[PDB]
RNA sequence: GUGAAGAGGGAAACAACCCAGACCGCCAGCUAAGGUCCCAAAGUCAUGGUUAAGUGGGAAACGAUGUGGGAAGGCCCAGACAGCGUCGAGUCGGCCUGCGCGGAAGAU
RNA sequence: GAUGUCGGCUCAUCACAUCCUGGGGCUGAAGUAGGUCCCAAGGGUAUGGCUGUUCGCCAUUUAAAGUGGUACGCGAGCUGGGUUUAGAACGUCGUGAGACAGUUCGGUCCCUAUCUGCCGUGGGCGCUGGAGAACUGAGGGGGGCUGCUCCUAGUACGAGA
RNA sequence: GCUGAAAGCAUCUAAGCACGAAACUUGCCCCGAGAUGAGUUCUCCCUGACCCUUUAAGGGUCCUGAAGGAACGUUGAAGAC
């Protein structure tokens, strides 16, 4: 998990999702691309 | 919206019972009950009630759930799990799945009401039940004991899933 | 000279209120008003002219938004580091009458007379009270 | 439930394999049930028991009437034990140390010996300051008791000199070495609170 | 300009900010700033919107299918947008703007 | 018309930007062991040599030897080594008296606690006739650390190690 | 994580459901009804006469003196008192 103020899609398989008031990036391809805004 | 518009075709030998919000679909496999969100206006047809801004979103979920209930009490759902690993084994004894997953202790998973398990081989588990949510949860719980390892793919996997391995 | 109520000739009546589904703070203001006697023409700041109020179903009082989980009640024990807290839902589980009592206490005057006014509030968790002898009239808040 | 006993004193039990077990000898005479509390009348389930004997001149009329209702002779005091949901007892029933026949461990409660007014060294294990190197009148004194203007007070619970002992203490999970029903004795391994002759409450170990 | 050398009302408390300049008395009335659910005097006022964060009631670069409004585009029943080996109307992503969200750690 | 100033000792108390122990995501994570980020403040968190030292270096421990706030916490609690009185000397500056953000040897630390607070312990009255007991438990406090060995198993993992 | 739309897909979340730590609430130990919101249970004790008067939870008089308490004494593994 990358915890950052700037979260963004890093590849085509990244998806932005908001869960419980938190912007997250989930990626089907690459576990390194998983991000949480914080 | 798009999902909510599409009507759920009720088959023969299924008696739907709209008790206002509490809908109870009794079929051949069994019975399933679901209370709905207040925005929904439950052939079967679903749509928004007045004074709810998320009515179509709530209508679409309610449609999807009752579609699954109809599939549930007619044909039912199956979920297969595979064991990968030297000495990894499963065996059902009534409604408890005993698993050997390379631990120092036994792993005995008690199945809930509705679900039944059969082991066709010692490294395969086959779950069966009406409720799609419950069979999903049991399969997730069994998988959680030993999640697929990223190096050799070892552990409890779903039969469908691809385990993306890597090498050191 | 302007009229003053006299403590020994004040008329105090008994009422019973059902808290079920009522918004906590909007219930509490009406209780506070009536415990103080602000609803009476004989209202006198230094005299308790208010009424006795039984509150039933304190455990079914309602709150809006995310307050059921997020409203926090703090207290300090007087011992260093002794800051304690409970959420609204925890308070309802443990001690439901305290939710209404705390809300009303904060809306009553501070000092001896405000404490005397609070003694006229009788809060119950469930639907039954022991004060049939006082013959409480139903009050729709 | 538990039983009320008396601390007789300490001794040892030599085992065959050459272990010396330090034991407290607890005299557990028949505990006589004086009252049964129930949910309807009392709001909780418990037995009240008495044990021993009391001089009739020292038994007050209110005390005597309470024993007379139970139909038991006056003992030296009254103690309650809470009942679990299975347990059931009658007024006037005797309960002997045989209760502990199959109990492996017990908790023993008593009143600790009284040390009177104790200093911080004894009471709280405070360290002494220098005996020499210039120390002026401050050998066993407590030192600082707070900070400065912030917070400008001493905090509650500050460890200071004061009364030590003469209070209720429970020692948990003591091995039952012997239950001697004939002699009304329970032998437990190790020390328990209080002086010789003091009352002890013995219960099956909670842990 | 005010305080100093200026009281009164407001800004919780708060010389210097806002309103306003106390000759004395009144258990009359109207207003100012500021207010009107309870503490605490007065709208649980009316009508139309926005916010779901207790935002309101601290904090930036920057980040984001939060949500409201506006003007204009591209594609599209010669079948669009994922399915496009498919069936049956919307679909895409810029721009501007209202209100919110993260960014957000401190000592009794 | 005085708010005692460095360090130590004694006794602490809070924050969390976490040193250990607990939970977790990513890893250029095979395992073992790490790295990095997130959650987490319950408890725990060296002794010595040298120096007035705080610190630091060093020796040897430890699961770890946390970082800060508290008048750089704490002298009406102790010390008085440092430092800034008066004595004396060196280097240095000055014709000199003397002087030094140089050094060196010596060199008085008062207070019987009224109030707040805190630790204990009584007396009074109350609680609605009086009295002796046993209680319920609102509420408050205490406690909460962790090593090593063995088994599981030389098993999983690994070309071995 | 499950199920799941908004957004035909996908999505742990919007509705609904599950797991998750020495932190939190309990469980363990001690205090604790001045908890003036002063609680509960058990037992014990007292079952006279009379007068006046702003007549009211009024004030005396004689008789009575319980349960129990305190005091005093001998004291304690209790204690500065
Ligand atoms: K002026
Ligand atoms: K707020
Ligand atoms: K500290
Ligand atoms: K890690
Ligand atoms: K901690
Ligand atoms: K000092
Ligand atoms: K001082
Ligand atoms: K001193
Ligand atoms: K004072
Ligand atoms: K009481
Ligand atoms: Mg969550
Ligand atoms: Mg006030
Ligand atoms: Mg003693
Ligand atoms: Mg020492
Ligand atoms: Mg001296
Ligand atoms: Mg001395
Ligand atoms: Mg203060
Ligand atoms: Mg001047
Ligand atoms: Mg002024
Ligand atoms: Mg003013
Ligand atoms: Mg003011
Ligand atoms: Mg007017
Ligand atoms: Mg105005
Ligand atoms: Mg008002
Ligand atoms: Mg209105
Ligand atoms: Mg705010
Ligand atoms: Mg912002
Ligand atoms: Mg002075
Ligand atoms: Mg943190
Ligand atoms: Mg702590
Ligand atoms: Mg804490
Ligand atoms: Mg805990
Ligand atoms: Mg050192
Ligand atoms: Mg200091
Ligand atoms: Mg410090
Ligand atoms: Mg001081
Ligand atoms: Mg010195
Ligand atoms: Mg000199
Ligand atoms: Mg001194
Ligand atoms: Mg506690
Ligand atoms: Mg504590
Ligand atoms: Mg879906
Ligand atoms: Mg531990
Ligand atoms: Zn990606």
The rounded distance, in Å, linking the Cα atoms of D77 and D201 is: 12
The rounded distance, in Å, linking the Cα atoms of C120 and C110 is: 15
Q: Could you tell me which of C120, C106, C103 has the C-alpha nearest to residue C53?
A: C120
C9: tokens are 């000739």
Q: Could you tell me which of D5, D2, D6 has the C-alpha nearest to residue D47?
A: D2
Task: Reply yes or no on domain B77-158 having CATH 3.30.460.20.
Answer: no
Q: Which CATH class is domain B1-75?
A: alpha beta
Q: How far is the CA of B151 from the C1' of F158 (A)?
A: 12
Which positions of chain F lie under 7 Å from any protein Cβ? 9-15, 24-30, 37-39, 70-71, 73-75, 77-80, 109-110, 116-121, 131-142, 151-153, 156-158
Q: Could you tell me which of B161, B166, B74, B82 has the C-alpha nearest to residue B119?
A: B82
Handedness of CA B37, B42, B46, B50 (dihedral sign): negative
Answer yes or no: are the C-beta atoms of B46 and B4 closer than 8 Å.
Answer: yes
Phi-psi region of C26 (alpha: psi -120 to 50; beta: other; left: phi over 0): alpha
Q: Is B68 helix (H, G, I), strand (E, B) or coil?
A: helix
C69 touches strand E (CB under 7 A): no
Answer yes or no: are the C-beta atoms of A34 and A18 closer than 8 Å.
Answer: no
Q: Could you tell me which of D49, D41, D31, D36 has the C-alpha nearest to residue D90?
A: D36
- B73's CB contacts (< 8 A; 6+ apart) are B14, B25, B26, B27, B28, B29, B30, B31, B32, B130
The rounded distance, in Å, linking the Cα atoms of C30 and C121 is: 12
State the Rg of chain C over Cα: 16
> What residue ranges of chain B are covered by domains with CATH 3.90.930.12?
1-75, 77-158
The rounded distance, in Å, linking the Cα atoms of A9 and A36 is: 12
The rounded distance, in Å, linking the Cα atoms of B81 and A18 is: 31
The rounded distance, in Å, linking the Cα atoms of B136 and B79 is: 8
Q: Is C in contact with A (3 or more beta carbon pairs below 8 Å)?
A: no
The rounded distance, in Å, linking the Cα atoms of D159 and D126 is: 9
Q: Where are the domains of chain C?
A: 1-141
Q: Where are the domains of chain D?
A: 1-207
Does residue D151 have a cis peptide bond before it, meaning omega lies within 30 degrees of 0? yes
Q: What is the resolution of this structure in A?
A: 1.6
Torsion of CA B5, B11, B17, B20, to 10 degrees: 0
| Residue D156 contacts C, CB cutoff 8 Å | yes
The answer to whether C78 contacts D156, with C-beta atoms less than 8 Å apart, is yes
B69: tokens are 């209930």
Answer yes or no: are the C-beta atoms of B70 and B131 closer than 8 Å.
Answer: no
Answer yes or no: are the C-beta atoms of D146 and D156 closer than 8 Å.
Answer: no
Residue D76, class by beta-carbon neighbours within 10 Å (0-12 exposed, 13-18 middle, 19+ buried)? middle
Instruction: Count the Cβ atoms, other than its own, within 10 Å of residue B63.
Output: 22
């Amino acid at each position: 998990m990358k915890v950052r103020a700037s979260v963004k899609k890093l590849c085509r398989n990244c998806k932005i999702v908001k869960r419980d008031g938190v912007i997250r990036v989930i990626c089907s391809a690459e576990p390194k691309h998983k991000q949480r805004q914080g | 919206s798009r999902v909510a518009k599409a009507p759920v075709v009720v088959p023969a030998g299924v008696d739907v019972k709209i008790n206002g919000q509490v809908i109870t679909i009794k079929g051949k496999n069994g019975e399933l009950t679901r209370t709905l969100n207040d925005a929904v206006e439950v052939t079967l047809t679903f749509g928004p009630r007045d004074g709810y801004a998320d009515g179509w979103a709530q209508a679409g979920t309610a449609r999807a759930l009752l579609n699954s209930m109809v599939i549930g009490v007619t044909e039912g759902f199956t979920k297969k799990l595979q064991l990968v690993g030297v000495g990894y084994r499963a065996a059902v004894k009534g409604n408890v799945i005993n698993l050997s997953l390379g631990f120092s202790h036994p792993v005995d998973h008690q199945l809930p009401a509705g679900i039944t398990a059969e082991c066709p081989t010692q490294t395969e588990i086959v779950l069966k039940g009406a409720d799609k949510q419950v069979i999903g949860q049991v399969a997730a719980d069994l998988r959680a004991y030993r999640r697929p390892e990223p190096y050799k793919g070892k552990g409890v996997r779903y039969a469908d899933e691809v385990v993306r391995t890597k090498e050191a | 000279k302007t009229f003053t109520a006299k403590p020994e000739t004040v008329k105090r009546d008994w009422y019973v209120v059902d808290a079920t589904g009522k918004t906590l703070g909007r219930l509490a203001t009406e209780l506070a008003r009536r415990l103080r006697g602000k609803h009476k023409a004989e209202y006198t700041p230094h005299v308790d002219t208010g009424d006795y109020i039984i509150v039933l179903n304190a455990d079914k009082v309602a709150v809006t938004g995310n307050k059921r989980t997020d409203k926090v009640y703090y207290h300090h024990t007087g011992h260093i580091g002794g800051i304690k807290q409970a959420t609204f839902e925890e308070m309802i589980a443990r001690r439901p009458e305290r939710v209404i009592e705390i809300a009303v206490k904060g809306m009553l005057p501070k000092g001896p007379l405000g404490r005397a006014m609070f003694r006229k509030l009788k809060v119950y968790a469930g639907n039954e009270h022991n004060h049939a002898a006082q013959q409480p009239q139903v009050l729709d808040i | 439930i538990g039983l009320v006993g008396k601390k007789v004193g300490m001794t040892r039990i030599f085992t065959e394999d050459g272990v010396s077990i330090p034991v407290t000898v607890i005299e557990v005479e028949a505990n006589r049930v004086t009252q049964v509390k129930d949910l309807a009348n009392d709001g909780y389930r418990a037995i009240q028991v008495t044990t021993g004997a009391k001089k009739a001149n020292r038994v007050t009329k209110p005390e005597a009437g309470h024993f007379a209702k139970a139909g038991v002779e006056a003992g030296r005091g009254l103690w309650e034990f809470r009942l679990a949901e299975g347990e059931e007892f009658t007024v006037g029933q005797s309960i002997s140390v045989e209760l502990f026949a199959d109990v492996k461990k017990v908790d023993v409660t008593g009143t600790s010996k009284g040390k009177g007014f104790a200093g911080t060294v004894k009471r709280w294990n405070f360290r002494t300051q220098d005996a020499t190197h210039g120390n002026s009148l401050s050998h066993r004194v407590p030192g600082s008791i707070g900070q400065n203007q912030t917070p400008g007070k001493v905090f509650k619970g500050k460890k200071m000199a004061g009364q030590m002992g003469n209070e209720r203490v429970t020692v948990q999970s003591l091995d039952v070495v012997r239950v001697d029903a004939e002699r009304n004795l329970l032998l437990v391994k190790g020390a328990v609170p209080g002086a010789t002759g003091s009352d002890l409450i013995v219960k099956p170990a909670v842990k």
